[PDB]
Amino acid sequence: HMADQLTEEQIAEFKEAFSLFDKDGDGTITTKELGTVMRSLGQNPTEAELQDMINEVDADGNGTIDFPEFLTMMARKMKDTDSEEEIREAFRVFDKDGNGYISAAELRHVMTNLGEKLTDEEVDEMIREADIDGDGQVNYEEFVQMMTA
């Protein structure tokens, strides 16, 4: 949903961008309006591709781009940036310091913040399971292949 993907500030910024394209203010983006801003940016496209880049996001097929369609375009652009990198943030939650290894103390820190509590001994049980190298720290490579700590 747009509320999940976009914040109030981003919606305001997109509206200003939409109004930059819509010099008329009627609420729709025509080919000439889209072509004008492209020339200001240096590009000199033809109407054949200019229509194509409108039809690619025009939902109702009226031939013009309104704000609901403009927001829907930007909502997809924000969403599809992250595809499978969600494990990177999950790794950094356990990795407080910022290096490439998860320490037992760092695993204690996240477990302390979470509801479940450890008796300072079973923390070694799952870290040695995740850490195959046996160095006492779980790196990023060990975390993605199998997640226990």
């Binding site: 969600e86 943030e89 999950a90 996240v110 997640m147």
Partner: peptide, 13 residues
């Protein structure tokens, strides 16, 4: 609960 709730614990921090 991690495989479905890992996004929540990340969102908590």
């Amino acid at each position: 609960l991690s495989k479905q709730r890992r996004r929540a614990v990340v969102a908590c921090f």
